[model samples]
Target: VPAEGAFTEDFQGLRAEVETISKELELLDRELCQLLLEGLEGVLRDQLALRALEEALEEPLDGPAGAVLECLVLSSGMLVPELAIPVVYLLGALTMLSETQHKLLAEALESQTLLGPLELVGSLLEQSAPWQERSTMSLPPGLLGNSWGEGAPAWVLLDECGLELGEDTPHVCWEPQAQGRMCALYASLALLSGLSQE
Candidate 1:
């Protein structure tokens, strides 16, 4: 499938298969299996394209008539959030293949779809700072109006009794344990972000 026509044919077929599966399984397995199958198709196409690139390496030293490869490489950027990590891995591999190819893919990656996840990742890493002193009691601004009002004592009592208030709903953590746990969780995500960039 190194030929452009064959690659494009297979690409469209795979895309069609994915779309059909999504529509058919929309009601029956809306959440769990749909996500699994979507990720499955993503990794499947990812591996195929990666393999195609490797196949091209063994051919005559000319570039794989790159328009087709460029589309595949750039389209991977559209898989942000769900398939972000794997797509990033593919992009990273393409960059290693050639600088001009990397520049082409980079230009294609300039869409807003990619920015949403990038911003979220930045905010998450910022918020997950272990040393920041977060108040155990948090309330929405103007929720009660003009101070905590008459309910201040009651609010304190409710909080003491484990009734969570406000959407922030900060978790009560033990002095020594909470930071470590959240740090590890954030650390895990950071590593996945690393994979996406790789």
Candidate 2:
């Protein structure tokens, strides 16, 4: 479903179905499933939209869309890379929407059941470093260069991280590894900032 309409329609259908199932499941399953499904929907839609980044970066996570995705993650009880990836795209986008920021978004941040777990991924990033997931949310020098800057591999951050590269970081050889650790590090920070709003 490369077409935007199709992609949107399919996920919207899935969203409706998930809501329906929430009515039958028992106990935490009802609560948990609802979060997971709605979250998947949120991720799918936002992601469907390359969608688009930061924390000021955290404000957007307080928006309507952010609250929906954030609550889904918290209610579900755990974070998955799938969900995290979405948070990055979705919440990041939410920040740019002036209308949502002033309207629907403002409404959600005021609620307790909402506003939590905007990015479980951020927490994972907070706890550790390096490519935490098997999947690559990373890019090679060609793509990584765009963000990391020319010829500069992702490890270039060590220079920024420390004023200069030195004795640390596992002495890995390939820049690909650097991209994994470094880009993910930035992404991690971005997501974390998004989650907390500070």
Candidate 3:
């Protein structure tokens, strides 16, 4: 015979096991996506994976769930932004895709990796500025005031870190490195969310 509290302890252990299983299932789903995309030759698998990834992100989970989604978004960006953004958006879209849209996007992402999360954000910020004297975009006063709490942009941050781009220089076109960084950011956000849930 067990002690009075033994049953309660056993139940708790069982509950923990179930939770672990649930998390593993989620991971498996994601892995399946990676495999399907990597293995298949045609555009169909690519489209499906992208759609699934975005759908996974959009699905409501609590605060922790949101964090996990963000992490995945960042991670995906880090891996390949050119591929990540469209795929993510497609997945996140409320409406299910018909056959045609899926194929088109898959082909687009397949072309080339470009623009990671940080670089994407930085490039966007730079482009938003108004053109001043010779090849320079002047930061508008009070732009990004509420969102960034005034005068704080990634370009500014990068510049402070000695990574300024010349004004005349064309915007950093999307590239493989940038895409990788974006994917990493998405993954980090997802992980953070998962950790917070615990």
Candidate 4:
């Protein structure tokens, strides 16, 4: 007669099934990351190409430039660290835009000076100051990870942009922590919108 609960036959079969499933999951994860990275690289390349064309035309590239800036800024919030570098590099390319392009960006940003969170982040990074200052709020633990309790470590912004609170907190959500998070989100959006016209 077969053993009760059928351990012998089912045990080995279950283990093999789990191993195969794990391998497939890992492959899927890698493919997703590759797709995301490729998309980000395309965005960065498009911005650079636009800048190059603007320089040759000897005309300002404010509107389109700002659009690219906005896309990059938004991407920073969504993309992983591996893709954030290209976004930063696109921001750095602003200097290469024509004088008209530069002025357009300046004027646009100046008009909406209150919106400066992303710029602030960039400026702080450029100055080599602590990036943690951006989010001076503590978050409930267990939210970011298991083992991280209610009053765990303070949250800090990722060097690559976006918001991270403690090790457990996920991306900053505007709904839950509206006061602090929304302010930052709006400021980022405003700056991106303003820069888009440049």
Candidate 5:
């Protein structure tokens, strides 16, 4: 009874230590992102911005500013199409640095409440390889929400929405918001495949 009581106390102490460390790391992460944002602002050109980003990845994995920015930029859901690709690539690179880094990245992601489809795709990257239909099946149904429908059918839905379809089959079209989400998902697949090969 005495021994078990001591063991429980010890476990509680260890749990507190973990909580303390997690809070400290979260604070440090925000500071690093703040500082890096200030510093990175001086990077004027796309090439320089990207080079700066690549260099930023060399920092410690625990709270790499680049990774935070990558998630923040992505979660904001607004990006120049050209710039978005590299941002997603940096996240892939950020995670590839170490398992610890990936865990930290996931924490940061959740803290920002970027939890829906973005989180889903981010998780898929961790699965790494050996792709399967089930992987696609696991994705959020609304990902291609605008592209298709149930018994209603896509063309009929489009017609109801005032974008009438012609005699030919209705080509899948991505509206602006949906377009960005799909692009992000596609980029994550690209990131996963690229990292898997390396």
Candidate 6:
């Protein structure tokens, strides 16, 4: 009783050696993915903690502002454009910023991040007719709109961040970094939505 293919004449090598390696990789892959997800979730939770700490404090609550800045800094870094875009959108939507501070944060982000919220805006534009018919319907006042009216800031950032792809680029591939970015984006949204009521 050996591997079915292992006993065949062609012997496709789905044997103990190949099977063991696959199993090992599967286990390692699962652990690695979980660790990455947890790490990403932790960063988002940092924002939430800051928000809570800010509310509990007496000053203008600079605590969460710092988290936004960190994301802004990384936004320019293009570490995770999709997720970075949404987090920044939520930050801009909810918080108030001064002129100088606004310029700095606005300058730090790339245009791609805006795609998430802008895509949402594009959808709203498409639905404007249907949206007007419903009395109970409401739109997000602003995710703070970063540095411009409504979603303009993120759009400009998108134009600013747009790039010409090189031939060598693989376009897209399945990886944990993308998923990590997804978690950050959603967590930011969840946190952003709840905090506005506070």
| Clash statistics: count for each candidate | 0, 2, 36, 10, 0, 7
Give lDDT tens digits, candidate 5, residues 147-194. Answer: 234332223322322222333333322232222222334333233222
Q: What's every prediction's RMSD, in angstroms?
A: 20.6, 18.2, 18.9, 19.4, 17.2, 19.8
Whole-model alpha-carbon lDDT for candidate 1:
0.32
What is candidate 1's lDDT per residue for 155-193, written digit by digit as tens?
232233233444344422222223332222222223222
Give the per-residue lDDT digits (tens) of candidate 3, residues 103-149. Answer: 43233235422123223343433353321213333432234331222
| Candidate 6 clash pair list | 85-113, 92-143, 92-144, 93-143, 93-144, 111-157, 111-158
lDDT of 1 at 59: 18
Candidate 2 vs candidate 4: which has greater TM-score?
4
Model 2 local distance difference test score: 0.32
1-198, model 4: which lDDT tens digit per residue?
565583222223423433343333233344443343333233334555455433422222244444333333343334332333433433444433333333333433444332333333333233322222344333332343322322321122221223443343442322222222322332333324422322
Model 3 spans > 4 angstroms off: 1-31, 35-90, 93-105, 116-122, 126-198
TM-score of 4: 0.21
**Ranking of all candidate structures by their lDDT, best first:** 4, 5, 3, 2, 6, 1
Worst 10 residues of 1 by lDDT: 59-68
On TM-score, the candidate that comes out on top is: 5
The per-model lDDT (C-alpha) reads 0.32, 0.32, 0.33, 0.34, 0.34, 0.32
Which residue pairs does candidate 5 place in steric collision? Answer: none
Give the runs in model 5 whose Cα sits over 4 Å from its true position.
Answer: 1-29, 37-45, 52-113, 123-138, 141-198
Candidate 3: RMSD to truth:
18.9
Error of model 2, residue 67, in angstroms = 15
Q: What is the Å distance of residue 94 in model 4 from its true position?
A: 5.9
Off by over 4 Å in 4: 1-45, 53-136, 139-159, 162-188, 194-198
